[model samples]
Target: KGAYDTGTYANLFQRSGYREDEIKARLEQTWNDLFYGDEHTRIYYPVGDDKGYMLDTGNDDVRSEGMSYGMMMAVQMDKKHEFDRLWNYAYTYMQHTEGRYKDYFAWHCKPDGTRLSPGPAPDGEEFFAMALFFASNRWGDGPAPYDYQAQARKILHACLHQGEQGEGDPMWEPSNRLIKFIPELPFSDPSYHLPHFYELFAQYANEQDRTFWKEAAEASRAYLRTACHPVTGLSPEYANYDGTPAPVQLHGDFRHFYSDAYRVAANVALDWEWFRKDPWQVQQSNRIQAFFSDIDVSDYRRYTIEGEPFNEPALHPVGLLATNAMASLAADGPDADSFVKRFWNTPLRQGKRRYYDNCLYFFTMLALSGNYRVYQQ
Candidate 1:
């Protein structure tokens, strides 16, 4: 058992011989840089009176992925005001209020509160629900739209039952309980699977959907085992429901290990850190760490599941390495401490692309310091 069963989280940095005060400083610096730093370093922007949006600096838009992540990080850090403001922004602008996409969030929206697409990405929905649940437990339910627990229940309910009326598609497939990449997509992104969060949902979601959430946790754990390479532990950006690489689509080939796949390492690591339900997680983390131990983070590149590298360099090397370092939560290999050391020496990334990198960097710091945990009621 991990934090869920034992009621305590292992701070990897502390265990690996880092100073407590120094680790705390690192966490505070990360929070400042991403959430309240200067123009280039900050991603979160306060909107209107009480709303706040996370700007995807490179894309120059408010994306659900970043916004949801903002909320999660905010709650994990116990920044209630930041969490509420971010949630208010999503609820006021990004979330749909009509048919089809109801209860789902628009993936892209301009800063002016105008939505660019009616579509929803399940990653955002999942993060939003998990963050809301944590907010409810940490701060207790609040007024009207701020009823965190109720809001989370609504999102989870729609994730499983939206399509039952034949009005719209559910976020996950009813057949296997695997989350779809998008509400309309037939496939899944392995990184989007969060058994760690889903496990809590089983206890907190609408009573009628508790069984589905429980099964979802198991389904995602099993699916994740197949998503990664047994030897290299590389996961694809997009995967078919059966856990095979998804074929090239209109956007491009997604079969290769790329940006989106980077999160899979961190997700699995967090699941193991939080719940410890799957022993395979340790081997998977070790396999991935072993694969990258020799490659400098500067030379990161696209790769196949078998460890074959492509010519294209990774756009977010800092983010990728952050996940790799976070994986040490479950990695029991000799190089585990080294990975954490390497990540600790690396500072927050700067410039236009800093948003994604800093988000992962902040989370890695949080997880390493044991600041990220199950906020038990």
Candidate 2:
């Protein structure tokens, strides 16, 4: 039942012989651990009476990445109030009124809503648009910022056409349909290619723009074949449109498998689950699981695409483990069951770096337990 296919979702836990009650219990517990857990891991913070923000504790700033992630969690879990609080916080603080980022939210800001950076991140925009569309489909639209579908379409329009009349560049590279690391960059973060989301955007976005997203889904799937290593399955943190590692002189080097690269496995697995458009996703998941099969979570290390481990230990081993476990959804290799069991026994990460790990952990829990569903209009 857990075997890979190019047409349907394989809820791995059920297929692995875990009972329904057990899956539900673990799912609820993981949700509690991240949303109501210890201070270090619990990112959702309330502000006064209504608004709230998800803090990037490591950076001591509120970020669009975390904010949008919070919304995704809320909508998936049916927590409408929490979703609204997160949206209110983002709309009130991170959103820009004028300039290159006029309709986009600031990438980072203070809890008091002061902008820390004027730039926008394309990953945040994509997640925000998808989550908002899901919210509208699940709970129906409301007023102003809460008019979820309209708000989502507005953001999508900006992402594809922002710079047409001005100096700013679009969030996506127009010709290639690959998302930029930023509005002006020529490269992409390989992990940011969520073709499953693009499949939905092709349906929900503006009619004229729908074909672009459809092509984007195809482009990203093809791009992943080049970006991910043939044997080891490791991907660079950032890569060019042609799938070679990209180097940014301004941000040092990001051409290896590290923190950001961890998500590629999970994204590919989820895309397979939702759309099943890429047969390679099954092999990709198997390859990643096989690569980490012998490594302990504590021994998790950064590596090159060719599979040479670096001296530096992974900054977020729990997150990597979570993503690896999520890969089981599409993995057909022998190590798939072992990875899922290892993740089941692992607890939520604690201490200073817990925010990112726990977020990934919770999402994995949702995916494995069949709680993460496609909410559509």
Candidate 3:
């Protein structure tokens, strides 16, 4: 029973014959490992009495990406207090009030809440809007900042209308409806194409904005087809609207498949699982799973969009593994269960880089157990 169609989710672990008690136990234990464990395994930290943040220990900053992720994690786990604290932290510090980027959030900041840049990342806003919408549906709205549905609508409004007054560019390219890497940038990040989320937003967002979001869902599904290589199923970290690799840029070269690109497979799988609107999603999941079926997680390396491996090792192989396994939701290929088994055997990544990996790990756990539900208000 697909959630969008029937309000029921697929329990992949059950389909694979795992016991109910074991799945619940593992989910609780992993949640503790990330939120309550010591420095080596924890990524979450409470700030003051009413706020909390997810720390990216590798970089030692409170990124908007993690903040939004933490909020969604809290809502999904039914930890209302945790969700509130994360929102308080983000609403209190990361949001901007002045200039062309008003209503947008700072991408990263010091743990104590000093801004690292005035710029905003499009993906963070996307997740924040989603998390808020879920919070409102699950728990209902409260005061202004805690009025979750309205807050979510406002963010989406800014994302689509930011350039109407000519103050700043919108996060989504107006004509194409594809999300940009950043509001001002002309290129797109293939990993940021979340058509499933867009489908829900089309329903939840303001009436006037609904049409744009509906078109966006279709646009992103089609765009991902072009962005991913036909043979390898690998997508570059960044690409132009046409879906070809972007030119080497001033910030850095992002023309190859690497960290940011890892999310594409998992995102595609979730879209297919939820809406099943695009038939391409199922085959794409199978294709990507097949490409990495023989490679060991430890041996995962950087690769070109065409699948040529580079010498550099993957810095977040655990997260990559988590994504590959998450694709099993849509993957109907022969080796699908192998990826799931390999992921179940690997322990939660520890030490400095555990934040990203553990976050990905927890989401996969929730998903595979069929606990990641869409809360209809």
Candidate 4:
């Protein structure tokens, strides 16, 4: 029913059944369906609308924003025209001008582009914004009202100061301040776009802002260490400004995303890979090893953290994807080669089909690992 986020047709595009062009056509079709006219808000639409163009028409605008990520998926697959259309539409309409407090952005509004009400919390807000800036940098050439640097600043400034204002360093004002005091609130893994924020900011950042970027990076690394579990060395999804772990258990939900959302800790650490040997890399490797030490090959289909199994299909592909990505940060030794080779040799989903998420992550891992032949050979 919730076709935008839950739809699987895009996944089908990679399979042998459809040609690349056919897949782009399908994704382009889906992209248009949800992001069309002001008459249709950018929300998740159910599976059955027959408009000539592809639109999700889902009731929730927040869900509709997610459709952009799908459009991004299309872009990664080379659907340039559709990517341009979606990017233009989002910048023109769906942005929030008045609210750090009014949900993240307008979920549902009128054809004239007005706010219906506060949409969902600004949980993954940075991703969409980052997606916008990233796409613009990679593709769009003509000038537009939306500046990637400006949009990035707008988003990060809100999260750093308004949304989660900091008390000391990494901890900031909680989006739900009513639920917790300011000192106790820190940015969670799902929201660590600050790393990307810094990276993005660096693209257009001046010397002064660049200093802040380094400062922010140090602050975040400190928080990550502080929040880690001493024994298992696992960092929960949430943490304190000083790096203390949040009080709840977070899961690696959806797909065998072993690299899951939490993998960002490792990815962020890669930014500073040249310095201090990157203890976070050790932490991730240790925890993953500890988690998998006793499990048989058959037992890996789904991830079970702290003893409870999730419904997601994990198995080997999930681990392979994460391992491949993680291996990318190989510490410049035989172990690095070992790590990369282990994952490269590991079979795909079943050794026949390559999952897109796996492909996306594997590429990222490759990018991070850098010039594999040096150590790989």
Candidate 5:
């Protein structure tokens, strides 16, 4: 059975034998740690007047990825003020008005609202639309940029129809329905395949384009089956349409299981939890967790999809731990419980690279606490 039905969702933490009071306390702590805690773990920074942006501390800039993530966290916690702050910053600074990415936020920007890159990242656009839709459903929309439903539909429309009339590119391949790493790319990021979000997009996007979201959901599920290795269930950071690892030309050797691949297990687990459309996810989750069962979190390493550990260590070990623990939603094995317990004992990461780690950490906490819910119509 799916974890949610209509407006109701499963409190998986309660089912897992976690005390209600303790779960509530941890959720609050995790939320505060990222949004308002010590400098490193906290990413939100208020800008001029009422707006704010989520800074990528390691990169010393703002990113649509973190901005959208901040919106997701804010809406999940019912913090409309913070949600509006981030959305405002994104719309004011990162959004392109007349480029190939018009109506899409730039992938990166400076803290002072300067565009660092004019291009849009498809993952950011997807998260931005999903979070905006959630905000609209959770709290009534306001005006202009805060007109959440309208804003979301506009982005979704652009995602599918951008290049149709002129000089831009659509985020997804029209013929196949798989999301590109960017509007111009032909390959996919395994971690960016969020079929769970697409399932909702089908219900809430503009009527004429709803069919595309439905097809996207099915295509992503099928794509994951091929992208993940059969035995180990590990996926590469980037893969081609046929699911083979993409070339390692652009961003140094992304053909291996690294930072980006960590999210695939979590995404698959959440999809199974939310929709229960794929029995393969059960095995996929089990395989990934089982593969890492013997590897200590401190010893987390980059690896080939075949499960051979690389000499290099994982850039975000805590983030990897978080996603693997989140995989317990669909994983059932001796290792699953161990992973949850290990994650519970580990605190959020600090230091320069905490942005990515803590973002994943909060999402894992949300899933485990049953707080990562669907804000439906």
Candidate 6:
């Protein structure tokens, strides 16, 4: 399994079971195994959950994608300066290679700095954008050393609009732009990412930009609250502005839950994760807790309160890592510990040699959790 191997990476070998140094070393090994070479970034050759893995050599998106891994590795290894250096290299040479668009980054590129493609992927771009916002917030900066910053602003401009649908019109009006490699509404994984965009944009915005960001943030909240489905509780991956469900095949996992309501839980998480200091985040937390409480875990596999057929196939351990980390961050001490344990206890290694959802989740856990005792020296 290239990047999607979810077995060992997301499993729980310990539960507060080792010293910090030991955990740190294990984390390092995990990092080395997942990443490649001097330019050390992540590459999932075939892409998707059950795809083949080959050397996607000379891909800048691969390199840029792993830049956060470098940061995570530095955190695990206690090499603060290495984090800075790795991040600097990523921002300087690898990010948004062509200042082609204001909002999107180059999807793929050659090691020689030639552009191969610009991602239409809100997921990858969200990761890059979140990492940028997180790093900049953690280690203050003067100006973004690259043009992607300005381009990102432009992308947001097109996606967020100032109008609402009228009588006999669609439920909501769209900003009419594609976020990632595709053009339709990638509302599932890509939806909550808006707040992060706001978090970063807020950093560089002047008064005018600030107003725009605030409007976008509110617009994002509105979209989540209004467009989400009443049942299934899952957001569709894409949709149109008139509130009509776009006729695309939903991901095998969640075909029903693709509306603004999916954001209720996810956006709450994003707001806190991205804008830690904002007062409104408290309201978000309270609402999220309410939603979680309203959820009856005794039979969570069911998509809705009305008993929809929700058969989630076996989940890879690594994919669980994202929810694990998100839950860990959202919960406190022992609860976080238990969440991690419960996730690991039910690990489902793929029979195929592909990187499933678990692979991505493993990287997520490695990136977000700083106290892994298994990876210490």
Q: How well does each candidate superpose onto the true structure, as a TM-score?
A: 0.98, 0.96, 0.98, 0.53, 0.97, 0.52
Q: Which parts of model 2 are misplaced by more than 4 Å? A: 1-9
How far in Å is the alpha carbon of 167 misplaced in model 4?
18
Which is better, 1 or 3, measured by lDDT? 1
Quantify all predictions' global Cα lDDT against the true fold.
0.91, 0.87, 0.89, 0.39, 0.90, 0.39
Q: Best to worst by TM-score, what's the order?
A: 1, 3, 5, 2, 4, 6
Across 231-319, the per-residue lDDT of candidate 4 in tens digits comes to: 44344444444444445545422222243334543444344332333456555545544544454434554432243445655433443
Please identify model 3 stretches exceeding 4 Å from their true place. Answer: none
- What TM-score would candidate 3 get against the native? 0.98
Candidate 6 lDDT tens digits, 117-138: 6443444344444444344444
lDDT by residue for model 2 over 305-361, one digit each (tens)? 999999999999999999999998789899999988888888988787877888888
Comparing 2 and 6 on lDDT, the stronger one = 2
**Model 1 residue 313 lDDT score:** 91
lDDT value, candidate 5, whole model: 0.90
Residue-pair clashes per prediction, in order, are: 0, 0, 0, 23, 0, 44
Candidate 6: lDDT of 4?
15
Model 1 scores a TM of: 0.98
The better-scoring model by lDDT among 3 and 6 is: 3
Query: What TM-score would you give candidate 5 relative to the actual structure?
Result: 0.97
Index of the highest-lDDT prediction:
1
* Root-mean-square deviation (CA) per prediction: 0.9, 2.2, 1.1, 11.3, 1.2, 10.6
Candidate 3: worst 10 consecutive residues by lDDT? Answer: 1-10
- Candidate 1: minimum summed lDDT over ten consecutive residues — where? 158-167
